[PDB]
RNA sequence: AGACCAGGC
DNA sequence: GGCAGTACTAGTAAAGAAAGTACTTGAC
DNA sequence: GTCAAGTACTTACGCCTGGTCATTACTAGTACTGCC
């Protein structure tokens, strides 16, 4: 029922944080499960 | 000039608030199976894009075997930012994390 | 009219500059920025001064040498915010720019500002009583109200600044 | 040309521009060539303005 | 994706809003006006559905960006609907606020203090104050002076509870929206709409409003007042109605009750402070999609126009008939009735066309599918082209069983080893083996099919001789002459080697061990995949004609996951019970009964033949660099071993 | 890699203050000028807004006007762009607000 | 109109016949085999309505 | 495996127009590479070996003044067994527009074949 | 979207909390097979000690603290817990609810403690009694579940895949109810 | 890109 | 020699044997 | 205000390879021919 949850989102003016795995494939994000449950930082020696 | 100066301070006050200090961190001291698979993958992308290799290349041409060799002597200059569900984070470097 | 802006820029960082992160921000982003018209300041960048990488974790000092760069998940290139001062030559309207005359033609009196920046004064900006001669030896000289050729310096109010093309140009006017 | 490898992603002026005098420009141009020469078409043009507030060609 | 082309910006969130009519007159490239798609001689007519301002169409440059077919993204256009019509996504909620509202004072028909009771409980549910909304309800024919004193203390409790919770580190000024406050908000709006619809008289000024009737879609009716209670409307001192008048009512109702409807239509606090309007429920402008997204199908000469062009033409056909019906009214009973009864029928058919464009099941007249039904089910858009997709760099073939493969490897054919390819950027440690691969060519394993230059350019090796191809082998590790591309290096799309990774997959993927990451080993002879027998019970794979997929991952983040994380050696135990899924199956189990029997005795030539037939130290199975053996079970008359003692030294 | 990178990867340009996938488009440059990426929604008409020679650009029709140059490229799937095409035909607006602003 | 019935299988009837299904009346004789070919002339079917049905009796 | 496809040059016209597409070779500078597959009638020889990209038939076009060729759109090689000249039945006697061509494909039993 | 967080506390993608610990003990199903096979792990003591390496894994740990509170609760529950559950004002949580089991050595579940102290009481078998209980608590801690595990996919594949193997309702009609 | 038909596991 | 009848032509317009919740109209 | 059957909109393993047939009536027009 895609356009029943669609109307209930636009009536609520519903902002979503793109957390669910079904919402991060529609918009093309890395998942928050497993490998994408953290970030990688690189230690650079010079300031 | 005035709005971005205020917005930069809010972006950096609410990012220091989410920073857990090194003596108050309480996650696991081990490096998980998901952190190992991304450290070896992110480094092998860097090695193939001409990053300075810190280990000796004994004829190995695979960029993923080199990052596996760098992890054995702990010569990977990377840091895991372990996210908490609040939005807060803990900075664990690869030299601190113990394997297996 | 050289002015100082401190800016904040969000730039990439390739893995070949992991040992030299200050050198990689300069060569990739700041060195192709000098002597070009930048849109988001309002002039031509002369040079840069005081490059500081904003460290990703806030719990360390700015005194520290080792800093953190957040790696993109898809690509090995890092990304970081950086602060640097730009000394940038910005001309605007109404200012008076001392220039050195470069083109002797009947269409536009071309002049170089600071011997680097192109400029010109259009014919409709030039009044009626300033005439031009027909030189056949070499494109001659402009006889002004004093009855003498103009050569060297010519101060003028600025009408418009051409920013869209390759180099910057100063549409100037001689009337006030 | 005009890529995230060339240009900054987002560029902001952080503070209002304040005008510098002649002495800070000549202090800069003797110091910005000092670190860089020790973009060569721009160093060929930065010396033209460095030799402008001092002398004359 | 290209790892040598980064991106600095990321989408953080989305939010669903109503696209207003003022935006899509500024958004629009060009308004399209006549219901002819393309005229004679194959050109698209200017002003129609296929237009050059809406995108480059069929070997012709665009009229908005001036680009060709491959580079024009397509542009937004619109039509001008002459009357405001009903949006079918919002009609079930438009018919709630068209009902339940007074037509005389233009509030709702509730009392104004109970409409205020939901105005400030929903404000507490925008912020993270699920518990303070019930303390608010504990505040208590009636004169209208103490009701202002009642509305004051309820409004001061909210402004104190929001101030306290935002100060005590709990709620952001963007509010808190968890899952269990979505429960209490959906429970509260459904209670509010149910109580609006059940009112006899308007409790602000006490007289009746005529009840509206909806039989089906495309129309609204109001009923005449009863023959009994017309007396109430004389002591205060059926009909089809127009969609401009329905809008004229609700442009007054939403203004007299602006302080309440801001919280019904917002889950989170409205930081934009935009007004909520009745123009949200109507659509005075249709947006036509870009012409890239409605290109026609083609099968030889059988070229048919798209279904959306068939539906947007019928709106434009009615949108010109409704203007030609205004010819006589612009000139001006019998000359007036026949031109008005045919104008009102144009109001219904332009509604029945704007419904049928959006929803095909709200049409009437096997129907042409609308824009709702390109999204709904399997064979929709979320389930056919978002959650599941067709992929590049992937093969499928019948599997044949194979021993002599090291239980984590797959056996790939030569003709899969030629086609599938991997981008290796050239470095100081590649130009020994990646110079040899580019010399071999597209048809010599291990070879290469393409080189990607630093500029993003791409040079194919297919139509090239070997003398032209060795010259490009000396082009790989060169310093770039462009300063703008000085940190980029060339990528050689080499073939799949024996060190690459492969993700195998057999349908139905009932659990995660039915999609594992195998290593590779190429095989010289035939066109089939080769699967070891320890993997045959994890995929539930037999060999009576099974075919199964082979996905070849394209970067180092994915090679490090199907070797370490989605690996087939990590999937020994299944997480259902903790029981293994991997092991030998039919001939090997029947052979260990005979080998480990007491009758099995082996002489010295037999015993040492079975060890090197399975260990083979040069492939790296032993751990000693020399095969150690045991003393035999029997020493006299001649030395014999045992099948127990086979597996002991194995 | 499967569902995004090797199926329908595109680096489309996004307006930063609209959050709009399919609004921004290529400017038609001049002789010697460069073609910038620019927005249709947050750009005002030039005769409506009566300038510094860099905020002004022009369509292919000849409609020269001045406005939104706050835009950038984001890696999306192409089917997200087709979703916005269908969903804006319904009258629904999507704001793809991006983090570096 | 018989060639349309035989090439498609679709039944077009205004005095709608006594049997339930409306499509799937003609099937291509394969000649992919001879055991295939003689099997078409001995097979019986119950109906296409009984195919998309939940019972088993 | 015997596969047959019908190449037909008259499914893009109607009602007595001049037939714009004729089998055979025209008088232009068409490349002499495909005399190996095709006869002088623009029809292929019996028994020849055809892989992907080889021409199935040659026809001269009148509206373009060019000898186009249709080609064999299959990745698996085949041999041409028989070529049928399907002639049209009418009172006006017509040049051929329809040709049926049968291919044979060697299916030697490879591995992965079901017995 | 439900998954193990770094709190060892499984929760949904939007942040709402499903459970405080996976299974009540946060141990992985694919790592807990030989966890209570104490007769197998005693016979293979010197070979299992190499793969867990106890001496090199003390510095990043707190060996001292979780073992003490695991004795405050084991002594309390043998003394109490003859009464039924409604009378038990417990006064002490288990060491999983107070101490991180992935960092604190000896922070084990109560069935693991009550089965190790039931095994090692009965039979008395150069490995002594205390070096075996110090290696099972290291075997327990390494057999913890990692943060980030897609648990609810695994939990829903562990029901949907054995359902294909299939006077009251029964089977796949019962799972639909 | 649908309809119907024939299969594969 | 030119008129009108037909036969065609290409042209542009209409097309019956399963499970559950949720809304709601019926009487009282 | 309310129970109460009645009316209405929803799903209904995975993906894989083939083949087929997919607008029709009619209506007005230009041209063909029989005719006087
Ligand atoms: N999801 C589906 N899987 C199928 C289907 N048909 C076959 N299969 C798969 O292929 C395998 C075929 O097994 P069979 O249906 O032949 C049962 P059978 O008694 O023949 O097993 P054996 O006697 O051991 O060969 C089985 O493991 C299924 O997982 C189907 O229609 N759907
Ligand atoms: Mg099978
Ligand atoms: Zn365009
Ligand atoms: Zn009223
Ligand atoms: Zn904009």
Residue numbers in the entry:
A (entry chain A): 1617 to 1663
B (entry chain F): 55 to 154
C (entry chain G): 37 to 174, 214 to 251
D (entry chain D): 12 to 49, 82 to 100
E (entry chain A): 1 to 140, 172 to 268, 312 to 406, 413 to 445, 451 to 735
F (entry chain B): 1090 to 1139, 1153 to 1203
G (entry chain B): 460 to 516
H (entry chain B): 803 to 917
What did the original publication write about this model?
After sorting particles with 2D and 3D classification, an unexplained extra density next to the A135 surface was observed in most of the particles with a closed cleft and strong DNA-RNA density, concomitant with streaky and weak density for the A49-A34.5 heterodimer. To better resolve this density, particles were classified using a mask in this region. This revealed that the extra density corresponded to A12.2C. In the 12-subunit Pol I* EC, lacking the heterodimer, the A12.2C occupies a novel position next to the A135 surface. The new position of A12.2C resembles that of the C-terminal domain of Pol II subunit Rpb9, outside of the DNA-binding cleft (right), and is distinct from the previously reported TFIIS-like position near the active site (left). Whereas binding to the TFIIS-like position is only possible when the DNA-binding cleft is open or partially open, binding to the Rpb9-like position can only occur when the heterodimer is absent. The second area corresponds to part of the A135 Hybrid Binding (HB) domain (residues 989 to 1000), which in Pol I interacts with the A34.5-Ct but in Pol I* interacts with the A135 N-terminal tail (A135-Nt), which folds back towards the HB domain. The A135-Nt effectively acts as a switch, changing its positioning to allow or to prevent A34.5-Ct binding to the HB domain. Binding of A12.2C and heterodimer to the ED1 are mutually exclusive, as A12.2C and A34.5-Ct use overlapping binding sites. Exclusion of the heterodimer in this conformation is supported by the movement of the A135-Nt towards the HB domain, which blocks the interaction of the distal part of the A34.5-Ct with this domain.
